[PDB]
Short mmCIF file of C-alpha atoms in Angstrom, two decimals:
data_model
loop_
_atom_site.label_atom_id
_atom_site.label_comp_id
_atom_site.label_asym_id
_atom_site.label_seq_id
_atom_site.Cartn_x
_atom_site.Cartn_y
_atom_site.Cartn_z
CA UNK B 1 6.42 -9.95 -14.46
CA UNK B 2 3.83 -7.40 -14.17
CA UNK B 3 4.13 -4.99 -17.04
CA UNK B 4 2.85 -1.41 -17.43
CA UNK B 5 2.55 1.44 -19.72
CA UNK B 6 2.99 5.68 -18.80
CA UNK B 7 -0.10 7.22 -19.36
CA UNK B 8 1.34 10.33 -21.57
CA UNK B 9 2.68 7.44 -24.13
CA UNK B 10 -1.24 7.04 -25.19
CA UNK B 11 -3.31 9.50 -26.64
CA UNK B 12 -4.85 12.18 -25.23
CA UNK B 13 -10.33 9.77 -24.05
CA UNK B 14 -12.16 9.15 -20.78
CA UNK B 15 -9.95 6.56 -18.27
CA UNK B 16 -12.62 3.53 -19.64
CA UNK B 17 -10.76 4.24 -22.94
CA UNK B 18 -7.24 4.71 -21.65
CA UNK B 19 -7.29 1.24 -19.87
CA UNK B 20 -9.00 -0.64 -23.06
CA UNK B 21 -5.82 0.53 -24.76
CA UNK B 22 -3.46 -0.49 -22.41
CA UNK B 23 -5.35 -4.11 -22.66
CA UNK B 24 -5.32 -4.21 -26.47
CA UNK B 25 -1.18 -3.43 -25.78
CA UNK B 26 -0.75 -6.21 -23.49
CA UNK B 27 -0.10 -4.20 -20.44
CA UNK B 28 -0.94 -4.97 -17.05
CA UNK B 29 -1.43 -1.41 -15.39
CA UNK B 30 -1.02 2.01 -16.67
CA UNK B 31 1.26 4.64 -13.97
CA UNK B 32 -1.36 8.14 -14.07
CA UNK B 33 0.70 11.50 -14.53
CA UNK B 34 -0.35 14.42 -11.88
CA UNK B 35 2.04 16.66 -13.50
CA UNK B 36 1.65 20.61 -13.52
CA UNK B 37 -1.19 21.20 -16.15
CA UNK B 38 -4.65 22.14 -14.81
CA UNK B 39 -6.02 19.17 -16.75
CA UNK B 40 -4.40 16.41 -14.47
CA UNK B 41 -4.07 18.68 -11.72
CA UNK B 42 -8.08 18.82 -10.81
CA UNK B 43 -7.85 15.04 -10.89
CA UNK B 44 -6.71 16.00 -6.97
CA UNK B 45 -10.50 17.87 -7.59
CA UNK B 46 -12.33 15.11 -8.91
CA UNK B 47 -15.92 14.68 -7.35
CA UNK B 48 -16.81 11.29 -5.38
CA UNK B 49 -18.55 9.80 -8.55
CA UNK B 50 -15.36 10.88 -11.26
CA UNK B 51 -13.29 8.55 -9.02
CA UNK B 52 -15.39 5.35 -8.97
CA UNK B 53 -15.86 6.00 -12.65
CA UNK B 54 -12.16 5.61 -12.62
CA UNK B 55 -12.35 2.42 -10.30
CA UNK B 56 -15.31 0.61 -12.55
CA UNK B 57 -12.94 1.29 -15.48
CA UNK B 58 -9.87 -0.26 -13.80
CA UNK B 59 -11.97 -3.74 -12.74
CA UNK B 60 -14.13 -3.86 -15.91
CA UNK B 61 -11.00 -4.26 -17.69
CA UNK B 62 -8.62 -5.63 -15.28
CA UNK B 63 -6.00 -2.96 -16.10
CA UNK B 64 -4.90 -1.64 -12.55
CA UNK B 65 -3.82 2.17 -11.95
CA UNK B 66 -1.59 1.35 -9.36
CA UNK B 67 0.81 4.07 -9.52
CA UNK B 68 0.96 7.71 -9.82
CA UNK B 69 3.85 9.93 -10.66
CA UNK B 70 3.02 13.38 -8.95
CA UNK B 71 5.22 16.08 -10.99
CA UNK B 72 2.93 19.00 -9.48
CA UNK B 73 5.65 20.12 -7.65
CA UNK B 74 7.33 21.19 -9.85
CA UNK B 75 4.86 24.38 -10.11
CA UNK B 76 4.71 24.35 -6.31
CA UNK B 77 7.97 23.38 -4.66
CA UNK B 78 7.81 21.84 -0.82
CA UNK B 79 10.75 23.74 0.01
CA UNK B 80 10.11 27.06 -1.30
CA UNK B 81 10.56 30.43 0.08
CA UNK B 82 6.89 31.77 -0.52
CA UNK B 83 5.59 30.87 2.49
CA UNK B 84 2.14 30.07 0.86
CA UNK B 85 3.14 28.17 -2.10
CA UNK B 86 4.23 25.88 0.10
CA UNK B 87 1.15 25.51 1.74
CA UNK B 88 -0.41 24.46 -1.78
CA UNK B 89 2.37 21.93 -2.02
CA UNK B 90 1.25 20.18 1.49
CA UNK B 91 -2.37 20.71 0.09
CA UNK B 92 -1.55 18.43 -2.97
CA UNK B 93 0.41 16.21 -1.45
CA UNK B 94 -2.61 15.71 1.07
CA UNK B 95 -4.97 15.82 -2.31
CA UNK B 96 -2.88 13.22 -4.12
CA UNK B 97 -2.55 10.85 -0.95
CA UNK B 98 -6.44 11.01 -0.51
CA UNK B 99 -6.98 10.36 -4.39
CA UNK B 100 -5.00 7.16 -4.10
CA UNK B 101 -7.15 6.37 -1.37
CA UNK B 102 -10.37 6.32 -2.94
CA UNK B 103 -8.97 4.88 -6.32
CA UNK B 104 -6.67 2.21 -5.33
CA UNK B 105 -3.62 3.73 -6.05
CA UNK B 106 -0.56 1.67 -4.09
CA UNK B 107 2.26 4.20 -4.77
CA UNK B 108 2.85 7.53 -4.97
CA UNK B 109 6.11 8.36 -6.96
CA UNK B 110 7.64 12.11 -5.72
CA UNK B 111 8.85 12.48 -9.55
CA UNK B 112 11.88 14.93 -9.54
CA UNK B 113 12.59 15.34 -5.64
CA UNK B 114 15.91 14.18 -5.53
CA UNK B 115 17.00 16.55 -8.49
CA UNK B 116 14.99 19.24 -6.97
CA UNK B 117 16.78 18.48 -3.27
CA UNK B 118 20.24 18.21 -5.02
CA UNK B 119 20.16 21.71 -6.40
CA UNK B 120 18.32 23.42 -4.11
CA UNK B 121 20.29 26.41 -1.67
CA UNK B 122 20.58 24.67 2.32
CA UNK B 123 17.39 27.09 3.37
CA UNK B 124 15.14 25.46 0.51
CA UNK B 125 16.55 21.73 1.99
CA UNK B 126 15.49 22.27 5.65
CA UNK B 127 12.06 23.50 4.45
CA UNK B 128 11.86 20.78 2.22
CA UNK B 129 12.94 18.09 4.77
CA UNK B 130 9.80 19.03 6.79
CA UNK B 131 7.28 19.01 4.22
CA UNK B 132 8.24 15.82 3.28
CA UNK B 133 8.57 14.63 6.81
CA UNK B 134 5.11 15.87 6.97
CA UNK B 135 4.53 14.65 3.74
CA UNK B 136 5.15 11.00 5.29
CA UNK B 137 3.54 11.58 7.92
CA UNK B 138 0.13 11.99 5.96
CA UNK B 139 1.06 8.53 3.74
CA UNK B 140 1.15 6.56 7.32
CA UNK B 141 -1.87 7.45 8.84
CA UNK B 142 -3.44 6.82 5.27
CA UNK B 143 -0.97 3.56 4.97
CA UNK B 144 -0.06 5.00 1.44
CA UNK B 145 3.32 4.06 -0.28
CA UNK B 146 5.38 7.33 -1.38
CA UNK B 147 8.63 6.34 -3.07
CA UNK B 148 11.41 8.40 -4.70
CA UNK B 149 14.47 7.93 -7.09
CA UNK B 150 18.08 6.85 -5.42
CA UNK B 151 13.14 8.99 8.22
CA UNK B 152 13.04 5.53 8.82
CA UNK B 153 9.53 4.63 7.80
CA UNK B 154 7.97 1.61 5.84
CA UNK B 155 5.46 4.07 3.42
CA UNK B 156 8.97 5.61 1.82
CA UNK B 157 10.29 3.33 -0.22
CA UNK B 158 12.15 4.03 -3.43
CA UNK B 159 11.27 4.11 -7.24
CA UNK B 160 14.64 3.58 -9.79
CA UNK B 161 14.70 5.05 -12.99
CA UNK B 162 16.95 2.94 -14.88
CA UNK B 163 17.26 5.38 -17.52
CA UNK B 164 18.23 8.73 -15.42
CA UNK B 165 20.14 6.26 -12.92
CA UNK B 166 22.08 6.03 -16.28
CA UNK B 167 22.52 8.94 -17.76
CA UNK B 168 24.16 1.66 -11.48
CA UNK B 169 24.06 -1.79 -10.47
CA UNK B 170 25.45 -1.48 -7.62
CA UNK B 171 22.84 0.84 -6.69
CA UNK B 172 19.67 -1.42 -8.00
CA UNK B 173 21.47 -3.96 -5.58
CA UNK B 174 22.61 -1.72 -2.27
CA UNK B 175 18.25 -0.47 -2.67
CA UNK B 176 16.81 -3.71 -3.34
CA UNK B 177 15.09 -3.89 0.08
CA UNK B 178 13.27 -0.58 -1.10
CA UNK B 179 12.17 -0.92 -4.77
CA UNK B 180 8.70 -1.15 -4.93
CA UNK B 181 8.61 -0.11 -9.18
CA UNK B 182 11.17 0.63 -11.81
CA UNK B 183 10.80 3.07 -14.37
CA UNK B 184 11.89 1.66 -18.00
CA UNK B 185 13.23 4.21 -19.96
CA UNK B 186 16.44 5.18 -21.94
CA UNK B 187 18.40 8.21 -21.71
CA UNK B 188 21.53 9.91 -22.55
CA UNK B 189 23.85 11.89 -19.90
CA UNK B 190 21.76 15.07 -19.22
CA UNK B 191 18.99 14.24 -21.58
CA UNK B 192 15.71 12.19 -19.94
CA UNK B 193 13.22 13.05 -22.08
CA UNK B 194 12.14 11.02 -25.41
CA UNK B 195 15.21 9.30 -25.82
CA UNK B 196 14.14 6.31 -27.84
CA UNK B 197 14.97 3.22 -27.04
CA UNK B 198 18.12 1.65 -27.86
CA UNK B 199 19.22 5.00 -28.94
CA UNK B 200 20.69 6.04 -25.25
CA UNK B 201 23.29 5.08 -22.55
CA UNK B 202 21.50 2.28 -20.55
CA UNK B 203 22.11 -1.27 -21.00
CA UNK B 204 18.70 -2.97 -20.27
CA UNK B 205 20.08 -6.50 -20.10
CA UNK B 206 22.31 -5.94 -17.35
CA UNK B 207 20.06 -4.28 -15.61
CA UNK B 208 17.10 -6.89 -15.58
CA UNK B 209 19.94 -9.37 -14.90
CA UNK B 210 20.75 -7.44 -11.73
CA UNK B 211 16.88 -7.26 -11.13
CA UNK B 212 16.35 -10.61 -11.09
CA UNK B 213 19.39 -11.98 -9.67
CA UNK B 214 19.02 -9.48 -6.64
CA UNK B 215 14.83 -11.25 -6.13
CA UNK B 216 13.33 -8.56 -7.60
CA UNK B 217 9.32 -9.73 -8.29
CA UNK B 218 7.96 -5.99 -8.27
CA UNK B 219 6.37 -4.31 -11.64
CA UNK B 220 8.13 -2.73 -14.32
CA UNK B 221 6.80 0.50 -15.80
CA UNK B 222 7.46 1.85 -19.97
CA UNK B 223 7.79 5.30 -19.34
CA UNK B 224 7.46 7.30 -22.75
CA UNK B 225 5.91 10.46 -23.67
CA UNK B 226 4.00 8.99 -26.83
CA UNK B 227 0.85 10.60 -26.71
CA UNK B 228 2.16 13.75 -28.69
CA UNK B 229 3.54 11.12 -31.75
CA UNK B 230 1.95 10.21 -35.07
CA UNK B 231 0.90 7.26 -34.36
CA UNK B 232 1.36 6.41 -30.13
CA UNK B 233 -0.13 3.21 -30.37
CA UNK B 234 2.25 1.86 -33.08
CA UNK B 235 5.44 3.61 -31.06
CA UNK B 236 4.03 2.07 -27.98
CA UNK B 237 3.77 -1.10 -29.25
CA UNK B 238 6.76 -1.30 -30.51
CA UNK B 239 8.52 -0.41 -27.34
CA UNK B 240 7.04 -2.84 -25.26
CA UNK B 241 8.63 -5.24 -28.05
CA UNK B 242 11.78 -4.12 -27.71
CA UNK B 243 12.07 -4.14 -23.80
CA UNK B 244 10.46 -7.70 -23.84
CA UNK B 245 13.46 -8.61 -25.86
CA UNK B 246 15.64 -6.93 -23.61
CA UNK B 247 14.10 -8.71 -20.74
CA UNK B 248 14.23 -12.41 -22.73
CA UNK B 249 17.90 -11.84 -22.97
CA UNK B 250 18.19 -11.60 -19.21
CA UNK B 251 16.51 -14.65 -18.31
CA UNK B 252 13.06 -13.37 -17.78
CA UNK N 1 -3.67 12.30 13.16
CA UNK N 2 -4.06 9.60 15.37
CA UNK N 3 -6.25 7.50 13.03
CA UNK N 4 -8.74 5.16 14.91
CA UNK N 5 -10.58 1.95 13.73
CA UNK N 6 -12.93 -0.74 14.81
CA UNK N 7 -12.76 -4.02 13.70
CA UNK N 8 -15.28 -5.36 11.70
CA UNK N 9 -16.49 -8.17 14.33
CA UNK N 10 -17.15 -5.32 17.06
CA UNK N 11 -19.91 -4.36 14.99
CA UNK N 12 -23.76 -6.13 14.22
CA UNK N 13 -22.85 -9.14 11.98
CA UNK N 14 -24.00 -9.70 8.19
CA UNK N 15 -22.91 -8.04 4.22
CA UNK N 16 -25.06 -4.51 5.26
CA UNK N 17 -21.52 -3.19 4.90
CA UNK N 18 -23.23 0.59 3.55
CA UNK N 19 -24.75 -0.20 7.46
CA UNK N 20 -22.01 -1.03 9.15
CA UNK N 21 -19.66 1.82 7.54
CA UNK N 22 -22.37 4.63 8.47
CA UNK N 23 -22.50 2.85 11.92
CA UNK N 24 -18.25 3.39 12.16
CA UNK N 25 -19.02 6.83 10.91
CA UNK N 26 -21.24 8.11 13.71
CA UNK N 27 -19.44 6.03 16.29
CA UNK N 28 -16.29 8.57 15.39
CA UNK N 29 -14.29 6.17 13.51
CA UNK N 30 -11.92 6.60 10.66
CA UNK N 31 -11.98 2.80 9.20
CA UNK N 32 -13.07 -0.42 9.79
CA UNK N 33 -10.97 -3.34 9.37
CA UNK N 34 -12.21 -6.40 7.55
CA UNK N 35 -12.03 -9.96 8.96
CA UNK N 36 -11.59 -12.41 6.32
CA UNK N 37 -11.49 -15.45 8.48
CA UNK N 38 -12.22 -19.02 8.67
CA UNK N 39 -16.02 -19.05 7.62
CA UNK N 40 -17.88 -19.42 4.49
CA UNK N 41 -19.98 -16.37 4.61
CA UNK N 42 -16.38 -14.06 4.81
CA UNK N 43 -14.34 -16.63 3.28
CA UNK N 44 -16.73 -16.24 0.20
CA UNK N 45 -15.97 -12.80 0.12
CA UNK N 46 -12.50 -13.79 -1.64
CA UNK N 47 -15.05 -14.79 -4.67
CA UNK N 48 -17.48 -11.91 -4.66
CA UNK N 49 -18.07 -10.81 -8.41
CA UNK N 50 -16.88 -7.17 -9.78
CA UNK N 51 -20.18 -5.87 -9.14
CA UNK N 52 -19.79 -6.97 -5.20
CA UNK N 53 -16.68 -5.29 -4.93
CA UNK N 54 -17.70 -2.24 -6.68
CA UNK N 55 -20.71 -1.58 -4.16
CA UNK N 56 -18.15 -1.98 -1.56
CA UNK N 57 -15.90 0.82 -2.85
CA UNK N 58 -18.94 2.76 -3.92
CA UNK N 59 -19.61 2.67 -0.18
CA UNK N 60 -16.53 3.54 1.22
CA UNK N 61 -16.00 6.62 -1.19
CA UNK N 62 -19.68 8.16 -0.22
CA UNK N 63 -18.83 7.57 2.91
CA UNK N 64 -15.70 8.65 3.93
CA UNK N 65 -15.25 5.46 6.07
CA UNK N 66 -12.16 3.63 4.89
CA UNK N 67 -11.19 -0.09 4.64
CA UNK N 68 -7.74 -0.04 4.38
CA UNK N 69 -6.82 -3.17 6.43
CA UNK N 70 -7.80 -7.01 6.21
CA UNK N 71 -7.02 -9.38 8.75
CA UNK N 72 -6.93 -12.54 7.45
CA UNK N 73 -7.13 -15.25 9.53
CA UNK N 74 -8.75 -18.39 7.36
CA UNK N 75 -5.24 -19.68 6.88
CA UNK N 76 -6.15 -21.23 10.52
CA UNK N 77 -8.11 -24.05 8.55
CA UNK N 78 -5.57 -24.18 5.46
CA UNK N 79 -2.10 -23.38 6.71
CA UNK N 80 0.42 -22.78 4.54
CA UNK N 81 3.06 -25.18 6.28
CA UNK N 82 0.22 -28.38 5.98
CA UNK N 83 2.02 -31.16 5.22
CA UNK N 84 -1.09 -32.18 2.55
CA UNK N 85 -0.27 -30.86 -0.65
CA UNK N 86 -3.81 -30.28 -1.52
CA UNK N 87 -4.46 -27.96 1.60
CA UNK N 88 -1.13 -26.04 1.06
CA UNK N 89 -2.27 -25.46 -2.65
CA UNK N 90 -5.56 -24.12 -1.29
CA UNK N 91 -4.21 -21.75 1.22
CA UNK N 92 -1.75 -20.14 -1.42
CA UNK N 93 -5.31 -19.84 -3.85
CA UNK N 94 -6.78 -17.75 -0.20
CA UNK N 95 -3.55 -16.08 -0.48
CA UNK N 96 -3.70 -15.18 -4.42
CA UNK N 97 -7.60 -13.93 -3.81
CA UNK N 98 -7.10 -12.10 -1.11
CA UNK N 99 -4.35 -10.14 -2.75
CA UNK N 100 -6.18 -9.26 -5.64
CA UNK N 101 -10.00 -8.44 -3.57
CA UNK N 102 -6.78 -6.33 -1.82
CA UNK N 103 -6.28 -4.62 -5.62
CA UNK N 104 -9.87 -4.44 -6.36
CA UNK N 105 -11.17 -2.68 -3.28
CA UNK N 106 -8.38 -0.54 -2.44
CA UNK N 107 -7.11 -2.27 0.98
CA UNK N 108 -3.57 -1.58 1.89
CA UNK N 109 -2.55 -3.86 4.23
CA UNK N 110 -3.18 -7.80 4.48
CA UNK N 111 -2.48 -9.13 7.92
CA UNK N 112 -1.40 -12.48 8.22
CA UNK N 113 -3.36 -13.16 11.75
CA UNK N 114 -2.01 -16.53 13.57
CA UNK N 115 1.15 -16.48 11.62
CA UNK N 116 3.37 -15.75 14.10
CA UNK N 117 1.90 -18.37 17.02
CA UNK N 118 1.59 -21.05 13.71
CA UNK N 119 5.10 -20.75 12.87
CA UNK N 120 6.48 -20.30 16.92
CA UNK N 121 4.80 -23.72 17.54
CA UNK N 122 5.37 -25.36 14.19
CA UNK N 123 7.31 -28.44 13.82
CA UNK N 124 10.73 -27.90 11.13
CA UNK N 125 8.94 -29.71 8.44
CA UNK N 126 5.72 -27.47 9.06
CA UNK N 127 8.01 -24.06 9.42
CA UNK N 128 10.24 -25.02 6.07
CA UNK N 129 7.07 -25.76 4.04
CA UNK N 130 5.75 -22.25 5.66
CA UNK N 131 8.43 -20.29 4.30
CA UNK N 132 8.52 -21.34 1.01
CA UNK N 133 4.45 -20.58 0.92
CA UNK N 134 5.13 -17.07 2.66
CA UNK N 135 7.73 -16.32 0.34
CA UNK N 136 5.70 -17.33 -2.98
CA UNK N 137 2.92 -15.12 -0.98
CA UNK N 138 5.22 -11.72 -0.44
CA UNK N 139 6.44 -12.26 -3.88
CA UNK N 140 2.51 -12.19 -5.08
CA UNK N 141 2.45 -9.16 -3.05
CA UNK N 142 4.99 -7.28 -4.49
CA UNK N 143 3.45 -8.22 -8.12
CA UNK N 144 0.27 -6.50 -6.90
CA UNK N 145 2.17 -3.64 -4.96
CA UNK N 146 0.28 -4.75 -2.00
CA UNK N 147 1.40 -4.64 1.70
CA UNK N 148 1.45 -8.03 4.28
CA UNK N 149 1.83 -8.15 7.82
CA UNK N 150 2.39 -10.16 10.76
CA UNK N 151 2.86 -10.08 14.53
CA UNK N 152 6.40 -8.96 15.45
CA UNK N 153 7.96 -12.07 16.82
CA UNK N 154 13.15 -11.74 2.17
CA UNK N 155 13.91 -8.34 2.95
CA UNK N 156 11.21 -6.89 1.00
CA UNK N 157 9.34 -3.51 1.36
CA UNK N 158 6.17 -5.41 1.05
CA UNK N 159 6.55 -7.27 4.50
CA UNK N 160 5.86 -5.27 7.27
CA UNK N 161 4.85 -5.90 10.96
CA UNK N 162 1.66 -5.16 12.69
CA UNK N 163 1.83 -5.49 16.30
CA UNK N 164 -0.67 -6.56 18.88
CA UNK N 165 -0.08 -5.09 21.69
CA UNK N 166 -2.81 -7.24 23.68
CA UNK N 167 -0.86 -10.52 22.21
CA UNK N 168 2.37 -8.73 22.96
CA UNK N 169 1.64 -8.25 26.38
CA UNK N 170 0.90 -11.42 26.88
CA UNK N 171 3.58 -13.29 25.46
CA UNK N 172 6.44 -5.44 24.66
CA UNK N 173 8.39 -2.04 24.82
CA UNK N 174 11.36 -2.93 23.47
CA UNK N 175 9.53 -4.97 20.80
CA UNK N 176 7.66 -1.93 19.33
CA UNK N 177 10.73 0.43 19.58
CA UNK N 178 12.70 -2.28 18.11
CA UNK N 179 10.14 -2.39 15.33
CA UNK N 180 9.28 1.20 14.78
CA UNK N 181 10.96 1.43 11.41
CA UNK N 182 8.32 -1.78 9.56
CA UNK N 183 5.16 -1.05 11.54
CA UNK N 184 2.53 -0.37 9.35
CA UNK N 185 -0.66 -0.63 11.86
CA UNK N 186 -1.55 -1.01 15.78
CA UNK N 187 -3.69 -3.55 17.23
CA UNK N 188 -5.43 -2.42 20.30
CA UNK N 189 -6.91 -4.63 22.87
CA UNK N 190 -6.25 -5.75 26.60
CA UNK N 191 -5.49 -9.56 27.17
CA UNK N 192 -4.55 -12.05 30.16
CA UNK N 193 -0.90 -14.21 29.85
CA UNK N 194 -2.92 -16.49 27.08
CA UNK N 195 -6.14 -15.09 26.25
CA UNK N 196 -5.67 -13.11 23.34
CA UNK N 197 -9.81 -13.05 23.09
CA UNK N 198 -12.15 -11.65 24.50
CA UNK N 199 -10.62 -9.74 27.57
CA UNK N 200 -13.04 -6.57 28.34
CA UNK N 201 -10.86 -3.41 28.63
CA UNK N 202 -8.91 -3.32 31.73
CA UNK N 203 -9.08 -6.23 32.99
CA UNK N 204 -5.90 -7.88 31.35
CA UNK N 205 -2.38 -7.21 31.58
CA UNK N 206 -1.72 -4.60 28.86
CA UNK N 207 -0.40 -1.31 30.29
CA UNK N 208 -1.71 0.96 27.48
CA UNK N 209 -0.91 4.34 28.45
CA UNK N 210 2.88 2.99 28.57
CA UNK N 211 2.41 1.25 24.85
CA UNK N 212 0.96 4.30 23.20
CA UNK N 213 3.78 6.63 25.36
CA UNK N 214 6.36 4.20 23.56
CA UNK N 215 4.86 4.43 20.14
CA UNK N 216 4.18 8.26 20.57
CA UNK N 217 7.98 8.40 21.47
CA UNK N 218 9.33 6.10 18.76
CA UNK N 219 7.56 8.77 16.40
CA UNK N 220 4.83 6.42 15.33
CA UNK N 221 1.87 8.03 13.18
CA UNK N 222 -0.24 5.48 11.81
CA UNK N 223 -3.67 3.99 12.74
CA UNK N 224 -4.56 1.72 15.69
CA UNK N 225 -7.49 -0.44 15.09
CA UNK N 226 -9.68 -1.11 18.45
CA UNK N 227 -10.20 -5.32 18.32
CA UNK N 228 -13.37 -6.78 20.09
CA UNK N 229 -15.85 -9.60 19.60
CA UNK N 230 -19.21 -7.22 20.49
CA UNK N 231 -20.62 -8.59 17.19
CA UNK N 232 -21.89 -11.17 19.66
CA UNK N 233 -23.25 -8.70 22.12
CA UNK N 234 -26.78 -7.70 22.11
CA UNK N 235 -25.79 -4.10 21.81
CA UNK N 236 -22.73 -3.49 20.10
CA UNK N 237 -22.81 -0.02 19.68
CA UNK N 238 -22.82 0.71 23.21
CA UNK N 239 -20.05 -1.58 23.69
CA UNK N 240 -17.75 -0.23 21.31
CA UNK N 241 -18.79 3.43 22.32
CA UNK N 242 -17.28 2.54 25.95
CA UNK N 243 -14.18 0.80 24.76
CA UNK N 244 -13.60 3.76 22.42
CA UNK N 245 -13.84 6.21 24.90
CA UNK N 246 -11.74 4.32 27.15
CA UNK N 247 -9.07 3.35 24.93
CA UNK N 248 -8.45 7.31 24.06
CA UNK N 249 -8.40 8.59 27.66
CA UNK N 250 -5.37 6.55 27.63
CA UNK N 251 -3.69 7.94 24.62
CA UNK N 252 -4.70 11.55 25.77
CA UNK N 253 -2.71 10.05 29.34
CA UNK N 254 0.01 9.37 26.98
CA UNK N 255 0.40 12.55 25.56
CA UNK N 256 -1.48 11.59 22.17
CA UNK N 257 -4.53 14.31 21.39
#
């Protein structure tokens, strides 16, 4: 069982750094955040050499990157309106599929897409629906997985969140065909954000039981948000505890 | 757009991979597809150090020239429905390695070349021992997030198909329209009823513009990967420069530009 850690639950340290952390934690892979700041953002602008720093640091220490939640479009929405802003979405979708490319990356995770497409006006859908056609597109002739939370086309796959899938088993069974990762986290209904574990609405157990009963063999990723915390080694450590116990419990 | 490959064997033989990705490079491709097949030299490749596989990626980054593909094919001398215990051990070890040199130097897909002949002529003890090795080998793969392949003819996204259509043809529309939905990669080359090797371009039975019209229809958008054997020839370059040019008059014939 192939166990990772988010990369905003350790501190904010060149990648080399990062991954030695991750190691020290007992994790298998950390999942890289391309969210909206500028800071992760010019990853996507990252010369030839800053990425195969980035590789060297992944196989000196065996701890794989092989995941990336994109939340940049959240600044620049595929189905908006401003008929240019759009344009930078394609552009960083085309950015981010080329990054995981040269580092290794296997997935892609479209973090927020279905929340985005479920409250979005009919206009904003149909111009969504092509960029991420397009979108999809790109990730086949680049054989690049993009998944999404629950076009016909074996580089979309799906990416469960446990946690806001709670705030469910028959829907981590009806998908299992399509999960390629699952985000561990807890939640609360309408809260996803630092929830702490064992504090929210999700029962783990059950669904690791329905993971593993349904063939599941794909990784599982600790998604927390650490890195702002007194200590986020300590707090990380001790959630990767907790859902190990959680996991025991389910026959794991 | 349509992404276009050569396969590693077309080109001059050897490790100068820097070499032989420039070569791809100037010859217009977008990748080159790695054999790892049943010799020592490639088969060793499965053991190269960190430092080996570093230089590789180092050379596909400078050089724009991708690797995203391995066909592996050295399963033809372990097989993974052997009734010796000891050779079925040491095919799932090829299997484990070639996963993780998969990890390590950013391939995506893994295909399972001979897999689909080996299990259509298998014996049932051969084909039950096969599936329990291919199904320990897709659940490696989705450990490692990594994509396998086979010829067309678990449920897991992980398993995908990668057509032939020079083996298809052979013994094809209906196949590839059938199988639009799991294929991950094209293989490209022209063949006679049973001789999937070395058939020059146009001289077998493969109707390509009719393939690539059926793909193009189907709404297929990923790579094709030009196979040939011109490793062997005493100019490869000029023999993959011809085939190339041939193949795509035939895709622009099929509406694909």
């Amino acid at each position: 069982i192939p166990l990772g850690i988010y990369e905003k639950a350790l501190p904010a340290e060149c990648w080399l750094e990062r991954l030695q952390l991750a190691k020290t934690l007992g994790f298998d892979f950390v999942e890289m955040s391309v969210d909206e700041t500028d800071e992760r953002l010019s990853r996507l602008d990252w010369s030839r050499e800053q990425r195969l720093a980035l590789v060297n640091a992944i196989v000196e220490t065996g701890v794989r990157v092989p995941s990336m939640c994109l939340s940049a479009h959240r600044r620049f929405p595929l189905g908006s309106e401003d008929d240019a802003v759009r344009a930078q979405g394609l552009e960083i979708m085309r950015k981010a599929i080329q990054f995981a490319q040269d580092v290794g990356i296997r997935v892609i995770q479209l973090a927020g897409y279905d929340v985005y497409y479920q409250e979005a006006n009919n206009e904003t859908r149909r111009r969504f629906r092509d960029g991420l056609k397009e979108s999809v597109e790109m990730a086949s002739r680049a054989q690049v997985t993009l998944a999404m939370e629950i076009l016909n086309n074996p580089w979309f796959q799906l990416y469960p969140d446990i946690g806001n899938l709670s705030a469910v088993q028959m829907e981590l069974q009806a998908g299992i065909g399509h999960i390629v990762a699952v985000h561990v986290k807890d939640t609360k209904p309408g809260v996803f954000k630092n929830v702490p574990f064992g504090e929210g609405v999700v029962d783990f157990e059950r669904c690791f039981e329905t993971l593993k009963q349904s063939g599941y063999c794909g990784p599982y990723l600790i998604e927390m948000w650490s890195e702002t915390a007194e200590d986020p080694a300590a707090e990380v450590a001790k959630a990767r505890d907790w859902v190990k116990a959680r996991m025991a419990k389910a026959g794991m």
